[PDB]
């Protein structure tokens, strides 16, 4: 139990009680030679992603991906911090390799849609997020990227329903609600935006997007 308690503690959510997750990370790193463990690296990557350490996301996930390039748990965070770094060649390579590796996984189609978003081809990203969403009904990135495609396309009425769907399917996820509130700004409807942003800020006290909004 001395080790498995910590191992289970690693896998909880990262927004709250962040420091204890860190101390558990050094606890595993010491006395157990598990610093090389893949899931320890995954936890550290998610720590870095939470406060938006996207450069550290890139470096750590590149170190882990060299050993294994198809860890499905690792990959979505790497897509996120790659699109944040706004680079198309490496996203492009990984997406085209995953397409021929795992044709039936929504992960690769999500990566393709992200690549098209990075290339600002909204029309194709529409379909390539729709396919990823259809493949995995439990894939929040799919719905939020879908509504991102809607919002960046020019039309927003369907983006409203999309963000509402993403919010309702996944209760307790602040990001769909936050993006829906950004859209409310886009329609100049601030009255719902106040409540939605308060709800999002209830669990995200320190992140640039919330405070900027």
């Amino acid at each position: 139990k001395e080790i498995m308690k910590n191992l289970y503690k690693i896998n909880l959510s990262k927004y709250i009680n962040t420091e204890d997750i860190t101390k558990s990370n050094e606890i595993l790193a010491k006395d157990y030679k598990l610093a090389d463990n893949v899931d320890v690296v995954r936890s550290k990557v998610d720590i870095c992603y939470t406060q938006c350490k996207f450069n550290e996301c890139l470096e750590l996930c590149e170190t882990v991906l060299e050993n294994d390039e198809f860890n499905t748990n690792i990959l979505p965070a790497y897509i996120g911090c790659l699109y944040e770094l706004s680079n198309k060649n490496k996203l492009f390579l990984l997406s085209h390799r995953l397409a021929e590796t795992f044709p039936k996984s929504a992960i690769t189609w999500f990566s393709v849609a992200t690549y098209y978003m990075s290339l600002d081809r909204i029309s194709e990203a529409q379909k390539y997020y729709s396919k990823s969403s259809i493949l995995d009904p439990s894939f929040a990135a799919a719905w939020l990227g879908f509504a991102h495609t809607y919002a960046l396309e020019g039309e927003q009425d369907q983006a409203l329903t999309a963000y509402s769907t993403a919010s309702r399917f996944f209760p307790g996820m602040h990001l769909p609600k936050l993006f829906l509130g950004m859209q409310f700004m886009a329609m100049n409807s601030l009255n719902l935006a106040e409540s939605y942003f308060v709800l999002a800020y209830d669990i995200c006290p320190n992140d640039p997007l919330v405070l900027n909004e």
């Binding site: 996120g80 978003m117 939020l144 936050l178 993006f179 886009a186 997007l209 900027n212 909004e213």
Partner: peptide
Amino acid sequence: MIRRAPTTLQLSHDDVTSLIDDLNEQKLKQ
């Protein structure tokens, strides 16, 4: 996660019109 592009503030035409007008009466003052 696909982070949304943060919204950016724009310089409106009404405020710049107000400022250029105020400058017009400012130079008309003396």
